[PDB]
Write a protein that binds this ligand. Structure first.
Ligand SMILES: [Mg+2]
Ligand SMILES: [Mg+2]
Ligand SMILES: [Mg+2]
Ligand SMILES: [Mg+2]
Ligand SMILES: [Mg+2]
Ligand SMILES: [Mg+2]
Ligand SMILES: [Mg+2]
Lengths: 378, 380
C-alpha cells in the first residue's frame, strides 16, 4: 500500500500571535453587541509587558478598549509576569482611530482579493485529519489547564501532527498517525516524566482515535526542554499571523486574507466563510469526497470576478456542473453573504470563539457557515 | 474546450503591510551586513503617522533603527502627509529587544512548523501565470513611477489577474487572461481617462503577453474611483500579512510562516526557500510538469519530521521515487540549508529585495533558491 506523510500544526490560545487574534475579535464582538453595523479593522500587537490595539473602527458603540484587552488577556491566563504577561499591570496602548458613521444586493466588495473553501470526507466535520488532530490537541491542552486536570500547564504552547495517508482515487484516507509533537508552557511543579505521562494519557490518547496510534507512532513531548515563560515575554505577536491554523492546516488553499479583527462584511472573512459552506455542502451532499472552491472580488463590485470548483477527481458529476450548482445555490455578493450567514447577530463572544482552535469544522451554532445547504442534482 | 478561472493578486511596495515587510527585511539586511550570525525576528507595524519596530535581535551590529525605518519609507516614496506618510515627520517607535550573543549538521530547528514549495512548467520561471502577471504588473507600476514614465503615480496600489486555464493531464495550460484589475494610488494632476490610458499602454500592454489578451478580456481600472492618499494613513500595516503574495498566489500550498524580518536560520524562511528549490528542480529536470513539496520540523531536532512530493499526476516516474531522489539530493537540516543557499552573505539589500513582488520566480543571483540542482534519474 503506497502512502505519504502530511503535517499540520496548531498553536494554543496563549501563543502571542493567537492572543492578538483573540483581542482583535474581542474588540469586534464588543462593537457588534452595541452596533451590529460597526465597521471594524482592529489590529493587535504584543511584546514584553505591552499590548497595542490599532486600526480603524466606524461605530456608534462606546467601547472600553483597555478593559477588553485586559479582560481577554486575564481570561486566557496571563495573570503574572512569571506566566509571560500580567493582564492587570502591563502597558496597554489604545491607538485605534474611532469615528461615527443600502440595498444589500448593490453593496460592492470593500476590497479585491480571493478566498478558498475546502472540505474532505475523511472526518465527520469534513476537515483534514492532520489539522483536526493538531487543533483538538491544542484545545484539550487549554481544557485540562482550566479544569484542573493538569494544573501545571501554562497558556502558551504548540502542537503538530503528521498523518500517513492513502490516496483513494483522489479521496484522502488516513492510515495512521506517524508523529505527534507537543511543546507546552508549564510551571516549576512538574517533572519532565510527569509532563510526558500527563500529555500522553490526559491530552493525546483522549483526542486521537486509538485506531490511528500504534507502537511505531513517534512522540516528541517538549523535545527542546523546559518551557516556563511564554506568551509575549521576550517575543512578539501580531494579528493575522496564524492564517493556515485558522483554516485548513496546509490542505486546500489560502487567498492570504486574515480573519480576526474584521467585521463580517469584509470579503476576507465572509467570502472565506461562504466558500467553506459551499465546499462542505458539495461533500455533505455526496456530490464529491473532496472539494476546493475559490471566489475573487474587485473593490466596489458586488458580483465575484471568478469562481472555481475542483473535486480532485472525486466528483460524481463533472466539476463544470458542480460550479453551476454552487453558483445557483450560493450568493457571493457581500451584502447578501452577511445576511445569509447571520454574521452581525453578535451574541456570546461569537467571533472571539473563532480566534483560537480554528474557524472551520466546529459544530457550535454560531458557526453558521458550517451548516450544510441542500444542493439540487437529481 | 473545458476551462476554469483561477485568480491571484499582488500589492504594491507602498501597501502598508508590504511597507512593514520591507522595513523588517531592511533591519535584517543591516544586521547581516555587520554580523552574518545575527539572530533577527523583527516585526513592524504602522498606522497614521507612525511606524513601530519590535521583536528580538541578537547581534554584534550597531544599528541606527530609526534611520533604517525613515530611509526605507522615504525610498518607497513616503515623502509627504499628502501621499499618506512622511518619512521626515512620522513617529518612529524603536521597541526592539537587542542583545549581544557548532557542527552545522547537528543544529536543531529553532521551531516547529511546515513549509511548501511549488513549481509549474506554465511559465519560463516555473511559476503560476496568474501570480506572475499580478506581480509583474505591480512591479511595473513601481518602475514607471520611479523612472518618471508615469510621474502621477503614488506608491500604494493593488493588482489582480484572473487566468482561464486548461487541465492537460494535471499540467496547467493558460488559455487567456480573463480579467485584469488595477487599483493604484495617484496624484491630483491626472484625470480618470489619463489614468486608464496610461495603465493600458505603459503598464498592462508591456507586461501581459499579447497571445493571452483578446476583445473579451475584462479590465477594471480604479473601479472604486480616485485613490490619492494611501499607505498607513487612516489604515494599518503589519509584517507577515501578505504571505500568499510572497509565495504562489493561491497555487501550491502554504504552511503559515511569514518570511520578512527573520534571519535565514529560521526554518519558516530557509525551509520554504529550499522546498521552492526542490520543486523547481523536479520540474526543470523534466521529471514532472508540476510539483508540490512539503517539509516539517520539530524544535530542537535537525532532521525534518516529514517530507512529501506530489506531481499532480504529471510525474514521469512515481512520486515515491521522486521523493527518494529529492531526499537524496537536498539537505533539509537547518544548519545546512543556510550554508547551501549562502543566506548569511548579506550584500546590497539582499532580503529587502524579496520583501515586495514575491520571494520566488525572480532571476536575481541573490535569489540562490531559484538555481536549479541537477537530479539523477532515468527517463522511462
Ligand atoms: Mg509569530
Ligand atoms: Mg514563537
Ligand atoms: Mg484584507
Ligand atoms: Mg492588511
Ligand atoms: Mg531625531
Ligand atoms: Mg487595505
Ligand atoms: Mg514562525
Amino acid at each position: 500500500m503506497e502512502t505519504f506523510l502530511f503535517t499540520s500544526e496548531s498553536v494554543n490560545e496563549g501563543h502571542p500571535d493567537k492572543l492578538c487574534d483573540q483581542i482583535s475579535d474581542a474588540v469586534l464582538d464588543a462593537c457588534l453587541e452595541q452596533d451590529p453595523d460597526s465597521k471594524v479593522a482592529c489590529e493587535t500587537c504584543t511584546k514584553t509587558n505591552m499590548v497595542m490595539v490599532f486600526g480603524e473602527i466606524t461605530t456608534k458603540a462606546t467601547i472600553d478598549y483597555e478593559k477588553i484587552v485586559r479582560d481577554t488577556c486575564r481570561s486566557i491566563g496571563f495573570i503574572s509576569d512569571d506566566v509571560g504577561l500580567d493582564a492587570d499591570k502591563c502597558k496597554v496602548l489604545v491607538n485605534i482611530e474611532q469615528q461615527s458613521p443600502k440595498r444589500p444586493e448593490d453593496i460592492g466588495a470593500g476590497d479585491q482579493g480571493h478566498m478558498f473553501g475546502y472540505a474532505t470526507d475523511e472526518t465527520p466535520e469534513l476537515m483534514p485529519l492532520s489539522h483536526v488532530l493538531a487543533t483538538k490537541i491544542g484545545a484539550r491542552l487549554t481544557e485540562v489547564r482550566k479544569n484542573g486536570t493538569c494544573r501545571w500547564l501554562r497558556p502558551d504552547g504548540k502542537t503538530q501532527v503528521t498523518v500517513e495517508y492513502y490516496n483513494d482515487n483522489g479521496a484522502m484516507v488516513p492510515v495512521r498517525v506517524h508523529t505527534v509533537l507537543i511543546s507546552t508552557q508549564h510551571d516549576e511543579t512538574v517533572t519532565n516524566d510527569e509532563i510526558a505521562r500527563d500529555l500522553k494519557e490526559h491530552v493525546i490518547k483522549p483526542i486521537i482515535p486509538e485506531k490511528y496510534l500504534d507502537d511505531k507512532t513517534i512522540f516528541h513531548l517538549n523535545p527542546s526542554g523546559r518551557f516556563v515563560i511564554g506568551g509575549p515575554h521576550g517575543d512578539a505577536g501580531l494579528t493575522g499571523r496564524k492564517i493556515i491554523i485558522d483554516t485548513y492546516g496546509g490542505w486546500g488553499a489560502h487567498g492570504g486574507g486574515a480573519f480576526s479583527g474584521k467585521d463580517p462584511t469584509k470579503v476576507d472573512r465572509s467570502g472565506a466563510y461562504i466558500v467553506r459552506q459551499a465546499a462542505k455542502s458539495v461533500v455533505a451532499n455526496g456530490m464529491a469526497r473532496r472539494a476546493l472552491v475559490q471566489v475573487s472580488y474587485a473593490i466596489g463590485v458586488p458580483e465575484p470576478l471568478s469562481v472555481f470548483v475542483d473535486t480532485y477527481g472525486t466528483g460524481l458529476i463533472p466539476d463544470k456542473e458542480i460550479l453551476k450548482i454552487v453558483k445557483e445555490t450560493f450568493d457571493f455578493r457581500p451584502g447578501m453573504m452577511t445576511i445569509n450567514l447571520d454574521l452581525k447577530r453578535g451574541g456570546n463572544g461569537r467571533f472571539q470563539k473563532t480566534a483560537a482552535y480554528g474557524h472551520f469544522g466546529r459544530d457550535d451554532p454560531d458557526f453558521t457557515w458550517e451548516v450544510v445547504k441542500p444542493l439540487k442534482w437529481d
